Amino acid sequence: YELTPEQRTLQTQARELAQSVFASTAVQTDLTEQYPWDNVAQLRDAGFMGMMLPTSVGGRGLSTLDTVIVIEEMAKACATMGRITVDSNLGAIGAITKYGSEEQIKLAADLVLAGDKPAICISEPNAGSAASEMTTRADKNGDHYILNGEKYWITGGGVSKLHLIFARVFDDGVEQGIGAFITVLDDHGPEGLKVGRRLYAMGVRGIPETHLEFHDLKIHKSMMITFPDGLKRGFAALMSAYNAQRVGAGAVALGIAQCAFEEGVAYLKRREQFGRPLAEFQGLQWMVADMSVQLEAARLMLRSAAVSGETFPDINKAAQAKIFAAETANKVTNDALQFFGSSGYGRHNPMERHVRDARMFTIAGGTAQILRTQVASKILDMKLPQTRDGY
Numbered sequence: 001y002e003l004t005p006e007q008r009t010l011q012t013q014a015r016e017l018a019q020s021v022f023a024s025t026a027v028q029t030d031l032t033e034q035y036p037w038d039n040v041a042q043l044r045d046a047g048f049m050g051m052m053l054p055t056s057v058g059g060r061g062l063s064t065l066d067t068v069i070v071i072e073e074m075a076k077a078c079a080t081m082g083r084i085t086v087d088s089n090l091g092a093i094g095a096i097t098k099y100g101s102e103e104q105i106k107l108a109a110d111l112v113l114a115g116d117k118p119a120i121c122i123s124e125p126n127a128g129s130a131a132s133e134m135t136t137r138a139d140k141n142g143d144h145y146i147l148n149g150e151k152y153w154i155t156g157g158g159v160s161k162l163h164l165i166f167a168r169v170f171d172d173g174v175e176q177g178i179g180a181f182i183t184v185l186d187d188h189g190p191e192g193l194k195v196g197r198r199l200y201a202m203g204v205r206g207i208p209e210t211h212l213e214f215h216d217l218k219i220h221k222s223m224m225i226t227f228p229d230g231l232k233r234g235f236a237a238l239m240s241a242y243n244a245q246r247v248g249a250g251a252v253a254l255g256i257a258q259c260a261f262e263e264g265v266a267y268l269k270r271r272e273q274f275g276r277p278l279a280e281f282q283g284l285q286w287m288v289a290d291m292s293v294q295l296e297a298a299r300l301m302l303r304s305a306a307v308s309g310e311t312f313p314d315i316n317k318a319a320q321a322k323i324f325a326a327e328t329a330n331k332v333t334n335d336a337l338q339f340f341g342s343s344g345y346g347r348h349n350p351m352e353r354h355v356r357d358a359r360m361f362t363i364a365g366g367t368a369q370i371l372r373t374q375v376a377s378k379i380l381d382m383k384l385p386q387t388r389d390g391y
């Protein structure tokens, strides 16, 4: 239940980069809401991008746990850098690594290792929790697929090059299921791929969340992730790669909470009222005790989930960890802010940002409610349909 000597080294390397470079840019990144290109370049040069890619394509061949360790250190410095580390190591790049062809893996690897944070494109304005109800379609046309539809809250929209787009595949009018399509966005850009309006967010403002439109987007069949056993199971396998994403997302939430925790504790020791430091008040001591307990548990849950499953973490262990970590983060950041008092409410301190940044993680990548349903389906060992006629 402890890190290996190699993992401490990886942790130290991650912490050094985050504290000496990223930490001093967190406040401004939140102010400008601008994608930190400079920081991403340093993140790449330190080998913290595409870590789970095989060594045969330039990757380090690391584990999910390795990334989770790195991700948390980045998040403790900057929530934006935390999420970037996630998307550039887990999720879309994970599904491509596992299910993609040699050509598709090489294209994805070259981009990520060059410093590109991939963008996954699943959610639609009328299809969030019910992702299987997405209206983005891909009609087959010869050896190509014509994509028409819209996505939103696309993390990295406008700055991401690599795109993994999920769409309902139709063959001569007949539905085939949902498949994933790879496309790359550049200055010249692919015809039909349009970056929609930006959705300005409560926190983690350093990464643009945008709408995304597809107007007769022509994708060759060599850029569709294919399966020998049909797309019907294909849509069930791509989201299994998202089980690793959730653990990473949980690590970001944990990182934010841990930072706020450390800052709150440090403040209690130096801030004095009634002739003494705040740390000498029992009620505040127990609050500190409560936070440390939940943080320790959260870190255990995340790390435990990371080493579970086969290629990706177990879907339910990951769901349990994500629920715990995200909800833990919301309480810790809020209570840590309370330690600062009035100054905690001031934007000249980072405490109010911590609450704003942490708030998204009970929502994005599957809400805490949808994850509870998932966990319940495991314990009860039954399907839990949400439709009116699912029984």
Ligand SMILES: Cc1cc2nc3c(=O)[nH]c(=O)nc-3n(C[C@H](O)[C@H](O)[C@H](O)COP(=O)(O)OP(=O)(O)OC[C@H]3O[C@@H](n4cnc5c(N)ncnc54)[C@H](O)[C@@H]3O)c2cc1C
Pocket (backbone or CB within 6 Å): 119, 120, 121, 122, 123, 124, 125, 127, 128, 129, 130, 152, 153, 154, 155, 156, 201, 209, 360, 363, 364, 365, 366, 367, 368, 369, 370, 386
């Ligand atoms: C910061 C951020 C970044 C994001 N980045 C991306 C990205 O990169 N790619 C991407 O594809 N998507 C992204 N999303 C979207 C997100 O992954 C989905 O939208 C998420 O599943 C939430 O969907 P929704 O907002 O449509 O929730 P809705 O489906 O509108 O749910 C609304 C509320 O109803 C509850 N609810 C819904 N269905 C049920 C049910 N059956 N039972 C009980 N309760 C229910 C939910 O818990 C939620 O609280 C991002 C979102 C955020 C906030």
Ligand SMILES: CC(C)(COP(=O)(O)OP(=O)(O)OC[C@H]1O[C@@H](n2cnc3c(N)ncnc32)[C@H](O)[C@@H]1OP(=O)(O)O)[C@@H](O)C(=O)NCCC(=O)NCCS
Pocket (backbone or CB within 6 Å): 122, 123, 128, 129, 130, 131, 132, 235, 236, 237, 239, 240, 241, 242, 243, 315, 364, 365, 366, 367, 370, 371, 373, 374, 383, 384, 385, 386
């Ligand atoms: C899965 C979800 C869409 C509900 O779907 P549903 O209508 O209950 O359909 P079911 O879960 O019964 O079936 C879907 C299949 O995909 C599989 N699946 C779904 N999510 C999965 C995940 N995260 N990991 C692995 N497998 C998954 C299920 O095992 C199931 O396979 P089966 O056919 O062998 O049973 C919803 O609970 C969910 O998790 N979505 C959250 C939104 C989201 O993920 N958005 C990401 C964008 S950031």
